[PDB]
Design a protein around this motif. Sequence first.
Motif, short mmCIF file in Angstrom:
data_model
loop_
_atom_site.label_atom_id
_atom_site.label_comp_id
_atom_site.label_asym_id
_atom_site.label_seq_id
_atom_site.Cartn_x
_atom_site.Cartn_y
_atom_site.Cartn_z
N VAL A 99 42.16 84.90 49.47
CA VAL A 99 41.44 85.71 50.61
C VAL A 99 41.16 87.05 49.99
CG1 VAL A 99 41.28 86.02 52.97
CG2 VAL A 99 43.18 84.82 52.17
N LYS A 100 39.87 87.41 50.08
CA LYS A 100 39.35 88.88 49.77
C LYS A 100 38.36 89.61 51.01
CE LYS A 100 41.23 88.40 45.76
NZ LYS A 100 42.48 89.38 45.41
N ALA A 101 39.05 90.79 51.27
CA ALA A 101 38.26 91.39 52.42
C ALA A 101 36.69 91.41 52.33
CB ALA A 101 38.85 92.91 52.38
N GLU A 102 36.32 91.48 50.98
CA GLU A 102 34.91 91.70 50.88
C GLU A 102 34.25 90.33 50.49
OE1 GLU A 102 32.82 94.34 51.30
OE2 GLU A 102 34.91 95.27 52.08
N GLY A 103 34.88 89.37 50.49
CA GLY A 103 34.51 87.88 50.18
C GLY A 103 34.64 87.62 48.65
N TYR A 104 34.90 88.65 47.81
CA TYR A 104 34.79 88.34 46.39
C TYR A 104 35.65 89.33 45.90
CZ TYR A 104 31.43 92.04 45.63
OH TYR A 104 30.99 93.15 45.76
N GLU A 105 36.01 89.36 44.55
CA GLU A 105 36.82 90.47 43.63
C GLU A 105 36.34 90.35 42.09
OE1 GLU A 105 41.16 91.36 43.47
OE2 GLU A 105 40.51 92.66 44.67
N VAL A 106 36.26 91.26 41.65
CA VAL A 106 36.10 91.05 40.19
C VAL A 106 37.32 91.84 39.54
CG1 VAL A 106 34.52 91.88 38.06
CG2 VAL A 106 33.57 91.36 40.49
N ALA A 107 38.02 90.88 38.53
CA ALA A 107 39.53 91.49 37.82
C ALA A 107 39.29 91.52 36.55
CB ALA A 107 40.46 90.74 38.66
N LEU A 167 33.93 81.23 25.65
CA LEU A 167 33.58 81.31 26.83
C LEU A 167 33.57 82.87 27.33
CD1 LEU A 167 36.16 78.83 28.81
CD2 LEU A 167 33.55 78.68 28.79
N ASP A 168 32.44 83.06 28.46
CA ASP A 168 32.28 84.64 28.73
C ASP A 168 33.23 85.17 30.01
OD1 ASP A 168 30.04 84.83 27.08
OD2 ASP A 168 28.56 84.28 28.46
N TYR A 169 33.37 84.10 31.09
CA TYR A 169 34.37 84.47 31.98
C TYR A 169 34.58 83.35 32.80
CZ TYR A 169 30.11 84.81 35.34
OH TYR A 169 29.01 84.49 36.26
N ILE A 170 35.48 83.38 33.96
CA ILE A 170 35.81 82.32 34.96
C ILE A 170 35.22 82.48 36.12
CG2 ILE A 170 37.88 81.65 33.23
CD1 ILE A 170 39.70 82.60 35.48
N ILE A 171 35.23 81.88 37.00
CA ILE A 171 34.93 81.93 38.47
C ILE A 171 36.24 81.29 39.32
CG2 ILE A 171 33.60 81.62 40.56
CD1 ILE A 171 31.09 81.80 38.81
N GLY A 228 38.69 93.23 33.81
CA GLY A 228 37.72 93.79 33.15
C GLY A 228 36.17 92.96 33.23
N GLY A 229 36.14 92.29 34.41
CA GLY A 229 35.02 91.75 34.69
C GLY A 229 35.13 89.92 34.08
N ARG A 230 36.36 89.54 33.37
CA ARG A 230 36.48 88.36 33.06
C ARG A 230 36.99 87.23 34.11
NH1 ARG A 230 37.41 91.28 27.91
NH2 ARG A 230 39.61 91.73 28.53
N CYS A 231 37.52 87.82 35.34
CA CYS A 231 38.29 86.96 36.29
C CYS A 231 37.56 87.03 37.52
CB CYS A 231 39.64 86.95 36.09
SG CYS A 231 40.40 85.79 37.54
N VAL A 232 36.64 86.33 37.93
CA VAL A 232 35.79 86.73 39.32
C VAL A 232 36.55 85.60 40.29
CG1 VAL A 232 33.42 86.32 40.45
CG2 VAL A 232 33.78 87.21 38.21
N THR A 233 36.85 86.21 41.56
CA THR A 233 37.41 85.44 42.78
C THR A 233 36.20 85.30 43.80
OG1 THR A 233 39.41 86.13 42.41
CG2 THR A 233 38.85 85.29 44.59
N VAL A 234 35.67 84.07 44.21
CA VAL A 234 34.76 84.03 45.47
C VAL A 234 35.57 83.29 46.54
CG1 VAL A 234 33.89 81.88 44.33
CG2 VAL A 234 32.45 83.37 45.91
N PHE A 235 35.21 83.66 47.67
CA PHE A 235 36.16 83.31 48.89
C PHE A 235 35.27 82.89 49.81
CE2 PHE A 235 38.65 82.97 52.53
CZ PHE A 235 39.90 82.46 52.26
N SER A 236 35.00 81.87 50.61
CA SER A 236 33.76 81.47 51.57
C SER A 236 34.06 81.24 52.94
CB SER A 236 33.00 80.47 51.10
OG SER A 236 32.48 80.60 49.68
N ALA A 237 35.40 81.73 53.55
CA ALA A 237 35.81 81.47 54.81
C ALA A 237 35.91 82.77 55.60
CB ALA A 237 37.14 80.75 54.60
N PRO A 238 34.98 83.31 56.22
CA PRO A 238 35.00 84.70 56.71
C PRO A 238 35.73 84.64 57.98
CG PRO A 238 33.11 83.45 57.52
CD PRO A 238 33.79 82.50 56.58
N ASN A 239 36.60 85.82 58.67
CA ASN A 239 37.31 85.86 59.55
C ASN A 239 38.19 84.74 59.53
OD1 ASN A 239 37.34 85.92 63.05
ND2 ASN A 239 38.82 87.25 61.56
#
Length: 466
Positions: free
Chosen positions: A398-406, A389-393, A408-419
Amino acid sequence: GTLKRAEELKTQANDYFKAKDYENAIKFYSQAIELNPSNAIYYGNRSLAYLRTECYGYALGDATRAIELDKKYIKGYYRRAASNMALGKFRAALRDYETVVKVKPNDKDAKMKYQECSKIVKQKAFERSVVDSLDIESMTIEDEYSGPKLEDGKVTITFMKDLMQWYKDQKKLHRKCAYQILVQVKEVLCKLSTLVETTLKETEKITVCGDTHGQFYDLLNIFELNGLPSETNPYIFNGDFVDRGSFSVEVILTLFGFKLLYPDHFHLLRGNHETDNMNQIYGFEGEVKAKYTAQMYELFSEVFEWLPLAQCINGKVLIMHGGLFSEDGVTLDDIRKIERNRQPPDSGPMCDLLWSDPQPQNGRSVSKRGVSCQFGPDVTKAFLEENQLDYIIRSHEVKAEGYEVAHGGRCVTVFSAPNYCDQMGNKASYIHLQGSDLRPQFHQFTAVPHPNVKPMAYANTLLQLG
Ligand SMILES: [Mg+2]
Ligand SMILES: [Mg+2]
């Protein structure tokens, strides 16, 4: 003066807390505790801030430390019982509500929590499939109901568009319709593998959203900003559709409807909030009982049980609500083989897929949430290499910018609930992936106005402290 320094740091932490900046609250409480590690109020306030950030394990330990310092610190017992509720440790919670309603028989708050706790305890004790004691065909739609109806039992794009409108005006879909959506959607999901597999051709795209937590008006904003789903605009909603937000019924029936309409291009993955232990505390079970019946709720609960746990795109990107595993050597085949139709166990691969978080240091720790693990970049690298595999999503945080890349790029967080919960003031985001190019592209968005209903308006009082 060490003690007066600890105390100033705790006052700053209280300030941070009140401004809903829990991450700093925690940090200043932690420094306070560093200077004076023997004050119950410090541990008790940090326990509450861990509770606010869903860190049940850490809240539990701090509450216990506070109680060990001062057996009369009543706050310590409520915040311990909250953590245990969220951990599925219902009897432990009751012992603490008991110790409280004891130390003052008078208390209004104490008995309400004790009773609410016992009621869940009593129910779980009590605890065929709900659909069989239902007679959907026999129900009748009253002549004067003018909201959306299925076109001969079938969901269509016109039904979806009127449903969305109806919900925007805060109106309720007739229970008969709600029942039919649920039954069909159960039928679709119960056919899926535990691991959903998608091939994206060179020219194709897919949108990945993270948690949406009953923020119905934000969910409509996703669709306006990124298009309605269809066969040329597929979506993955990576769990946590409900709870906290007070339009959770509207979110989940919209998502289920679209899953029936585009079953091969609209994918729903289970989150930790598609579970009973969470729904009985965080608003969903109460919202469904308010708007419909306890029986409708039991049906939602059984559908959630068939939600797949992870999705793999072109054998290269692996998507799950939580994260990776407490144990080495887990394969994609192992995920495919998970018997998913149940509540998650207290540990094991099914539990990790719903609950785990990345941590920045190497290795594994017991998770701050009290269930599953935290996993370092060496854990992520080994699992990806082992599985080609290349990476996980993943989502779940919760992330302040709605996402984070951890990692070395192999673990991506996406969060879709603003405020989030009307308080965090965070941006939200969704991801685009493309068959020719599977690197995540992030799109951020802000919250949109909604009607006058508070987050957790339908939840019991067990996790509304401070
Ligand atoms: Mg989550
Ligand atoms: Mg969540």
